[PDB]
Design an enzyme around this catalytic site. Sequence first.
Site, PDB file in Angstrom:
ATOM      1  N   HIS A  53       0.816  -1.214   0.000  1.00  0.00           N
ATOM      2  CA  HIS A  53       0.000   0.000   0.000  1.00  0.00           C
ATOM      3  C   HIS A  53       0.848   1.261   0.000  1.00  0.00           C
ATOM      4  CE1 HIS A  53      -2.953  -2.974   1.223  1.00  0.00           C
ATOM      5  NE2 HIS A  53      -2.234  -3.225   2.302  1.00  0.00           N
ATOM      6  N   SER A  76       1.941  -0.484  -5.205  1.00  0.00           N
ATOM      7  CA  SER A  76       0.996  -0.750  -4.127  1.00  0.00           C
ATOM      8  C   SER A  76       0.452  -2.160  -4.272  1.00  0.00           C
ATOM      9  CB  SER A  76      -0.169   0.247  -4.137  1.00  0.00           C
ATOM     10  OG  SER A  76      -0.983   0.041  -2.992  1.00  0.00           O
ATOM     11  N   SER A  81      -5.632   1.491  -2.152  1.00  0.00           N
ATOM     12  CA  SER A  81      -4.983   1.828  -0.896  1.00  0.00           C
ATOM     13  C   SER A  81      -3.942   2.935  -1.022  1.00  0.00           C
ATOM     14  CB  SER A  81      -4.344   0.582  -0.300  1.00  0.00           C
ATOM     15  OG  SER A  81      -3.393   0.018  -1.211  1.00  0.00           O
ATOM     16  N   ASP A 131       3.414  -7.622   0.505  1.00  0.00           N
ATOM     17  CA  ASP A 131       2.284  -7.554   1.433  1.00  0.00           C
ATOM     18  C   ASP A 131       1.127  -8.277   0.750  1.00  0.00           C
ATOM     19  OD1 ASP A 131       0.073  -6.969   3.048  1.00  0.00           O
ATOM     20  OD2 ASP A 131       0.714  -4.935   3.495  1.00  0.00           O
ATOM     21  N   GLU A 156       4.621  -9.118   4.754  1.00  0.00           N
ATOM     22  CA  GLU A 156       3.998  -8.225   5.722  1.00  0.00           C
ATOM     23  C   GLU A 156       2.827  -8.870   6.457  1.00  0.00           C
ATOM     24  OE1 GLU A 156       4.940  -5.334   6.697  1.00  0.00           O
ATOM     25  OE2 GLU A 156       3.188  -4.323   7.565  1.00  0.00           O
ATOM     26  N   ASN A 181       4.881 -10.660   9.820  1.00  0.00           N
ATOM     27  CA  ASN A 181       3.574 -10.565  10.464  1.00  0.00           C
ATOM     28  C   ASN A 181       3.619 -11.055  11.902  1.00  0.00           C
ATOM     29  OD1 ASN A 181       0.468 -10.228  10.171  1.00  0.00           O
ATOM     30  ND2 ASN A 181       0.714 -12.325  10.955  1.00  0.00           N
ATOM     31  N   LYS A 186       4.291  -6.434  15.342  1.00  0.00           N
ATOM     32  CA  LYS A 186       3.507  -6.342  14.119  1.00  0.00           C
ATOM     33  C   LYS A 186       2.110  -6.902  14.369  1.00  0.00           C
ATOM     34  CE  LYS A 186       1.908  -6.654   9.886  1.00  0.00           C
ATOM     35  NZ  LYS A 186       0.680  -7.357   9.409  1.00  0.00           N
ATOM     36  N   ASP A 190      -0.224  -3.904  14.719  1.00  0.00           N
ATOM     37  CA  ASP A 190      -0.825  -3.604  13.422  1.00  0.00           C
ATOM     38  C   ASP A 190      -2.185  -4.294  13.254  1.00  0.00           C
ATOM     39  OD1 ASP A 190      -1.444  -4.218  10.583  1.00  0.00           O
ATOM     40  OD2 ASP A 190       0.536  -3.385  10.099  1.00  0.00           O
ATOM     41  N   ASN A 191      -2.204  -5.628  13.287  1.00  0.00           N
ATOM     42  CA  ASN A 191      -3.413  -6.353  12.906  1.00  0.00           C
ATOM     43  C   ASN A 191      -4.579  -6.011  13.826  1.00  0.00           C
ATOM     44  OD1 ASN A 191      -1.207  -7.473  11.571  1.00  0.00           O
ATOM     45  ND2 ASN A 191      -2.054  -9.546  11.580  1.00  0.00           N
ATOM     46  N   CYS A 195      -6.584  -1.871  13.115  1.00  0.00           N
ATOM     47  CA  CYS A 195      -7.979  -1.944  12.699  1.00  0.00           C
ATOM     48  C   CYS A 195      -8.900  -1.284  13.711  1.00  0.00           C
ATOM     49  CB  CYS A 195      -8.390  -3.399  12.479  1.00  0.00           C
ATOM     50  SG  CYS A 195      -7.464  -4.168  11.086  1.00  0.00           S
ATOM     51  N   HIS A 315      -7.587  -9.192   3.665  1.00  0.00           N
ATOM     52  CA  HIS A 315      -6.658  -8.727   2.626  1.00  0.00           C
ATOM     53  C   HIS A 315      -7.266  -8.744   1.222  1.00  0.00           C
ATOM     54  CE1 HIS A 315      -2.750  -7.613   0.978  1.00  0.00           C
ATOM     55  NE2 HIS A 315      -2.967  -8.501   0.024  1.00  0.00           N
ATOM     56  N   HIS A 374      -3.910   2.227   8.762  1.00  0.00           N
ATOM     57  CA  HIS A 374      -3.368   2.367  10.100  1.00  0.00           C
ATOM     58  C   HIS A 374      -2.587   3.677  10.241  1.00  0.00           C
ATOM     59  CE1 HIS A 374      -4.706  -1.633  10.336  1.00  0.00           C
ATOM     60  NE2 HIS A 374      -3.570  -2.284  10.520  1.00  0.00           N
ATOM     61  N   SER A 382       5.416  -2.219  12.631  1.00  0.00           N
ATOM     62  CA  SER A 382       5.476  -3.132  11.488  1.00  0.00           C
ATOM     63  C   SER A 382       6.658  -2.815  10.579  1.00  0.00           C
ATOM     64  CB  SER A 382       4.177  -3.062  10.683  1.00  0.00           C
ATOM     65  OG  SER A 382       3.044  -3.226  11.513  1.00  0.00           O
ATOM     66  N   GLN A 386      10.062  -4.681   9.220  1.00  0.00           N
ATOM     67  CA  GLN A 386      10.411  -4.867   7.813  1.00  0.00           C
ATOM     68  C   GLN A 386      11.859  -4.464   7.549  1.00  0.00           C
ATOM     69  OE1 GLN A 386       9.358  -6.193   5.119  1.00  0.00           O
ATOM     70  NE2 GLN A 386       7.149  -6.549   5.248  1.00  0.00           N
TER      71      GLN A 386
HETATM   72  N1  LIG Z   1      -6.880  -4.278   6.614  1.00  0.00           N
HETATM   73  C1  LIG Z   1      -5.786  -4.294   7.360  1.00  0.00           C
HETATM   74  O1  LIG Z   1      -5.161  -3.252   7.643  1.00  0.00           O
HETATM   75  C2  LIG Z   1      -5.199  -5.635   7.723  1.00  0.00           C
HETATM   76  C3  LIG Z   1      -4.241  -5.745   8.727  1.00  0.00           C
HETATM   77  C4  LIG Z   1      -3.723  -6.985   9.055  1.00  0.00           C
HETATM   78  C5  LIG Z   1      -4.162  -8.103   8.383  1.00  0.00           C
HETATM   79  N2  LIG Z   1      -5.115  -7.981   7.440  1.00  0.00           N
HETATM   80  C6  LIG Z   1      -5.702  -9.182   6.791  1.00  0.00           C
HETATM   81  O2  LIG Z   1      -6.853  -9.551   7.501  1.00  0.00           O
HETATM   82  C7  LIG Z   1      -7.031 -10.984   7.434  1.00  0.00           C
HETATM   83  C8  LIG Z   1      -7.107 -11.553   8.828  1.00  0.00           C
HETATM   84  O3  LIG Z   1      -5.843 -11.371   9.498  1.00  0.00           O
HETATM   85  P1  LIG Z   1      -5.606 -11.890  10.987  1.00  0.00           P
HETATM   86  O4  LIG Z   1      -4.235 -11.564  11.442  1.00  0.00           O
HETATM   87  O5  LIG Z   1      -6.755 -11.463  11.816  1.00  0.00           O
HETATM   88  O6  LIG Z   1      -5.730 -13.471  10.798  1.00  0.00           O
HETATM   89  P2  LIG Z   1      -6.244 -14.482  11.911  1.00  0.00           P
HETATM   90  O7  LIG Z   1      -5.894 -15.897  11.525  1.00  0.00           O
HETATM   91  O8  LIG Z   1      -5.698 -14.060  13.223  1.00  0.00           O
HETATM   92  O9  LIG Z   1      -7.882 -14.332  12.007  1.00  0.00           O
HETATM   93  C9  LIG Z   1      -8.829 -14.773  11.023  1.00  0.00           C
HETATM   94  C10 LIG Z   1      -9.941 -15.422  11.804  1.00  0.00           C
HETATM   95  O10 LIG Z   1     -11.044 -15.737  10.931  1.00  0.00           O
HETATM   96  C11 LIG Z   1     -11.669 -16.893  11.441  1.00  0.00           C
HETATM   97  N3  LIG Z   1     -12.502 -17.462  10.389  1.00  0.00           N
HETATM   98  C12 LIG Z   1     -12.081 -18.177   9.296  1.00  0.00           C
HETATM   99  N4  LIG Z   1     -13.050 -18.560   8.502  1.00  0.00           N
HETATM  100  C13 LIG Z   1     -14.194 -18.067   9.115  1.00  0.00           C
HETATM  101  C14 LIG Z   1     -15.560 -18.146   8.782  1.00  0.00           C
HETATM  102  N5  LIG Z   1     -16.030 -18.807   7.726  1.00  0.00           N
HETATM  103  N6  LIG Z   1     -16.444 -17.538   9.604  1.00  0.00           N
HETATM  104  C15 LIG Z   1     -15.984 -16.912  10.691  1.00  0.00           C
HETATM  105  N7  LIG Z   1     -14.723 -16.782  11.117  1.00  0.00           N
HETATM  106  C16 LIG Z   1     -13.869 -17.384  10.278  1.00  0.00           C
HETATM  107  C17 LIG Z   1     -10.515 -17.773  11.902  1.00  0.00           C
HETATM  108  O11 LIG Z   1     -10.910 -18.768  12.841  1.00  0.00           O
HETATM  109  C18 LIG Z   1      -9.564 -16.730  12.515  1.00  0.00           C
HETATM  110  O12 LIG Z   1      -9.701 -16.591  13.925  1.00  0.00           O
HETATM  111  C19 LIG Z   1      -5.883 -11.495   6.562  1.00  0.00           C
HETATM  112  O13 LIG Z   1      -6.328 -11.491   5.210  1.00  0.00           O
HETATM  113  C20 LIG Z   1      -4.813 -10.418   6.774  1.00  0.00           C
HETATM  114  O14 LIG Z   1      -3.873 -10.361   5.712  1.00  0.00           O
HETATM  115  C21 LIG Z   1      -5.641  -6.788   7.103  1.00  0.00           C
HETATM  116  N1  LIG Z   2      -1.101   3.009   6.562  1.00  0.00           N
HETATM  117  C1  LIG Z   2      -0.691   1.831   6.044  1.00  0.00           C
HETATM  118  N2  LIG Z   2       0.367   1.818   5.194  1.00  0.00           N
HETATM  119  C2  LIG Z   2       0.789   0.647   4.699  1.00  0.00           C
HETATM  120  N3  LIG Z   2       0.307  -0.577   4.916  1.00  0.00           N
HETATM  121  C3  LIG Z   2      -0.744  -0.542   5.751  1.00  0.00           C
HETATM  122  N4  LIG Z   2      -1.490  -1.607   6.201  1.00  0.00           N
HETATM  123  C4  LIG Z   2      -2.439  -1.072   7.049  1.00  0.00           C
HETATM  124  N5  LIG Z   2      -2.367   0.234   7.175  1.00  0.00           N
HETATM  125  C5  LIG Z   2      -1.296   0.585   6.352  1.00  0.00           C
HETATM  126  K   LIG Z   3      -2.635   6.459   7.908  1.00  0.00           K
END
Ligand SMILES: NC(=O)c1ccc[n+]([C@@H]2O[C@H](COP(=O)([O-])OP(=O)(O)OC[C@H]3O[C@@H](n4cnc5c(N)ncnc54)[C@H](O)[C@@H]3O)[C@@H](O)[C@H]2O)c1
Ligand SMILES: Nc1ncnc2[nH]cnc12
Ligand SMILES: [K+]
Lengths: 461, 463
Positions: A53, A76, A81, A131, A156, A181, A186, A190-191, A195, A315, A374, A382, A386
């Site tokens: 991103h 990206s 993003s 990522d 990532e 990750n 991280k 981050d995760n 969020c 993701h 974030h 994070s 890296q």
């Molecule tokens: N948007 C963001 O900024 C951001 C940040 C970090 C990670 N992510 C992404 O978010 C996703 C989740 O990451 P994470 O670290 O939480 O993983 P994680 O493994 O910790 O959590 C995912 C959860 O989903 C549950 N799950 C799976 N299938 C399901 C279903 N059918 N119904 C209900 N629950 C279900 C699993 O049991 C698990 O607990 C990944 O794709 C990751 O890359 C996004």
């Molecule tokens: N601000 C940000 N920059 C890059 N990667 C990210 N993933 C989640 N938030 C982000």
């Molecule tokens: K930001």
Amino acid sequence: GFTDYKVADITLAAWGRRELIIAESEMPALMGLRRKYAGQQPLKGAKILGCIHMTIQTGVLIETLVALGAEVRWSSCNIFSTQDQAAAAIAAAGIPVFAWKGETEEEYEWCIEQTILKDGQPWDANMVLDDGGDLTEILHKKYPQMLERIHGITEETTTGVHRLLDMLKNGTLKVPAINVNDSVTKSKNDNKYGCRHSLNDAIKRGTDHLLSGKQALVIGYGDVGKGSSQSLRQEGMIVKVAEVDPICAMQACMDGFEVVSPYKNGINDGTEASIDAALLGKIDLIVTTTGNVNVCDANMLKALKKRAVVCNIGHFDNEIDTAFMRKNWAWEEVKPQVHKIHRTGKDGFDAHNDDYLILLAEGRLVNLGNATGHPSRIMDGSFANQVLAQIHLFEQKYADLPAAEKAKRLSVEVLPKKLDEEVALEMVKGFGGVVTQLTPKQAEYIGVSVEGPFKPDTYRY
Amino acid sequence: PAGFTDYKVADITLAAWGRRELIIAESEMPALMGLRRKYAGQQPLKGAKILGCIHMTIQTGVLIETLVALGAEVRWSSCNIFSTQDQAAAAIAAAGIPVFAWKGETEEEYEWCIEQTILKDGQPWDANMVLDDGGDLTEILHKKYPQMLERIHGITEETTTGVHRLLDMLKNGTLKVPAINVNDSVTKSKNDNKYGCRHSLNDAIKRGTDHLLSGKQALVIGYGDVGKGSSQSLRQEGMIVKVAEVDPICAMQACMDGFEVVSPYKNGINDGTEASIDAALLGKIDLIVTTTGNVNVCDANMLKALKKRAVVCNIGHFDNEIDTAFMRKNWAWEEVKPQVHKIHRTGKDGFDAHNDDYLILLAEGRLVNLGNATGHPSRIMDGSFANQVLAQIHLFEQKYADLPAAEKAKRLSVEVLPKKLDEEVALEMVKGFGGVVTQLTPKQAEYIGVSVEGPFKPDTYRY
Ligand SMILES: NC(=O)c1ccc[n+]([C@@H]2O[C@H](COP(=O)([O-])OP(=O)(O)OC[C@H]3O[C@@H](n4cnc5c(N)ncnc54)[C@H](O)[C@@H]3O)[C@@H](O)[C@H]2O)c1
Ligand SMILES: Nc1ncnc2[nH]cnc12
Ligand SMILES: [K+]
Ligand SMILES: NC(=O)c1ccc[n+]([C@@H]2O[C@H](COP(=O)([O-])OP(=O)(O)OC[C@H]3O[C@@H](n4cnc5c(N)ncnc54)[C@H](O)[C@@H]3O)[C@@H](O)[C@H]2O)c1
Ligand SMILES: Nc1ncnc2[nH]cnc12
Ligand SMILES: [K+]
């Protein structure tokens, strides 16, 4: 005369530079690495293909790698993003970057290929920062010869690490990787907390809906789902959580959430009759957080309350069956990354129809699509990881080993806890926090060194 | 790094080698590295700007990089023209640290090197701390740059000679900033000064001459900490060691330690005449070593009376312990190799290459352990330099330069570190040996009237 880039509007560069300067004050772990290693130039000779991103936070990461001696080519990892002012600032600094908010799929792949290719020929890259695994996949699939010269990959996010472990087990991974990750600074920063900050942020920017008093369903309760549920609960939403993992479900219960399934008795047989229509009929907002496929499916979308918001913060966009909605329902753009989806038919819509859903970011990562992801002070953790991971893999020079030695170092690893702790210390100081130091007898009493690591590798925090 | 030219060393390409030895030295310095690890998070020296003047050895490299790791900036020079290890200096400069030091400086180059630390871009550096070994940097500041002392919080002085100069300044009211006497920590004085010289004196004599020592006659002038360690250095090799002393208590120790106590002068009376020299005695001595910190304890008449081919060296801080000026004026110098000269007593102008009437002078009379070898080992300097770091933190945090005049008056002194800190340094040294210290029971600590944590001895205790 620098032209090796493609961004939305180069004139946004000054604005981007102003925000990069601010973000640098919000990222002490990353700026401490920049100061500590600048004179040693540990990345001199590194040529990094980067796919993540193209935000202001990523800009500080990019210029940290460059400050340590690296050359980079950047794209990206998502079509929505990028922050165009960040991409503009990076291009204006003479760094190849191919990224803008609102790419098409075709433009997304073209941007990655522009990092891989220089002047129509494969760049002499020797490091990868990814990522989600799209760049990693393209290299293995379409440019395997380039991997012969690449010392490693630093990945990532959870989905990317999963794809990496799949390739390792199938014997198709060509270079070693570091799982960024699974550092605590991280994953559990981050995760989760990221969020927490950015989910309600995106929803407010896209819809300006009051959340207090309304009903939300969060699919998943891993790190992202934990932070997402908190993002909504702290705003006063009534949050219900779905899970397939009983341990994560237990945590949701103990955290004060009702645990429900979209399906009667949790059994998803594919039929409309399995949907808990009474439950979905009351939901104002559904958020997918799983990293899995089709966890908000076509039958759930049909059953959702009129005018419910639907978004995904995992993701990839296949968490939601947006394909079903493109095939059957008419889309009305409210503004960029905000669509009303009219469940009355595919051909046309009544502008005053009341039976619609609001989809954010066309089901792509909603925090980055509809806000800015974030915040800098979270991404600091994070991105320090890296930088540390890039240095480790680049200095190990895997690609220069004989065939026999590569086979013995092909692995997916995490950074040691001592480095995790050192990142955490810098983050704590950024808050003004003061960590206590053990006395020698206190360190002996719990069996650790005064300077750490303070926990065994099995500790879960 | 790129663009850094703010140094002067013999050969920058030695830096890789210096780094390899610094990495070994860290494994040998547990007290010092424990402080580096202990204080790294707090950065207790952030904002410290330290003028440092001490033998630019590998061991000093570990001390310098510990100070920097704790937040300090430093500008460094050696406190002796022959004591620098060129690979240590190279590694420090390659790290982007200003250092002006090389083995074999002239006296002019030596003074130039101290001034290069004092001045940055042609103006006084905004220094606020001083680490010194021997008092030469301290003397230059007070005499040539007195205005710089208005901003300096303190001096941490390494060695006996430098501490004597500080107390003379304090007694005369000419000392401008407070000092910590690092020398008189027990983990310095009774470790560095004694056991350090035990290790490195016979080391330097072997490297310079490769002479058998067993069975030969030695005269050690002085029996303080350096004299005690030097005498053991030679006795343990099998030399027959005689000791000279002006202090009857130290002489008593020499006797009880099994040495014959003698004087170069008949009845100990040094009236400056040739007839007062015990010629029979000095005619049997194969090796003389000065250890006093005093002036002219191996005088011209002693040198004239020494046994042919005797070795002459000094392990006190300054070369004026030996009347080398007399030898330069009257006798011909033949260089055997660097820091090894044959001094031919047959006359000034020229010499016979097969002349038998010469003496062997080591390091031209400068500190022989550092001039002809590498000084004390890392595991001994670990104690001295852990004290240096503690002394720097204490004086920097006290912030003398920022106090009002009445608060300065209460702090303008020369002090040692608290015994509790002395004990904590000692403890890490012991653990580095695999030693296990016993903990008092509460009943035992009550019985002898101490805390279980220490301090275990009153401040009067001499160890
Ligand atoms: N948007 C963001 O900024 C951001 C940040 C970090 C990670 N992510 C992404 O978010 C996703 C989740 O990451 P994470 O670290 O939480 O993983 P994680 O493994 O910790 O959590 C995912 C959860 O989903 C549950 N799950 C799976 N299938 C399901 C279903 N059918 N119904 C209900 N629950 C279900 C699993 O049991 C698990 O607990 C990944 O794709 C990751 O890359 C996004
Ligand atoms: N601000 C940000 N920059 C890059 N990667 C990210 N993933 C989640 N938030 C982000
Ligand atoms: K930001
Ligand atoms: N070379 C090294 O590595 C090293 C290490 C530590 C100290 N030093 C230096 O060595 C010198 C001695 O240090 P120290 O700690 O032993 O001091 P010290 O006070 O413990 O001992 C010096 C001794 O010399 C005796 N003495 C003085 N004049 C004498 C004379 N004319 N004849 C005989 N004996 C005489 C004194 O009585 C005293 O006991 C100082 O210059 C100190 O800075 C050198
Ligand atoms: N090796 C050493 N390094 C620094 N100072 C010293 N003084 C005596 N030996 C020394
Ligand atoms: K040494």
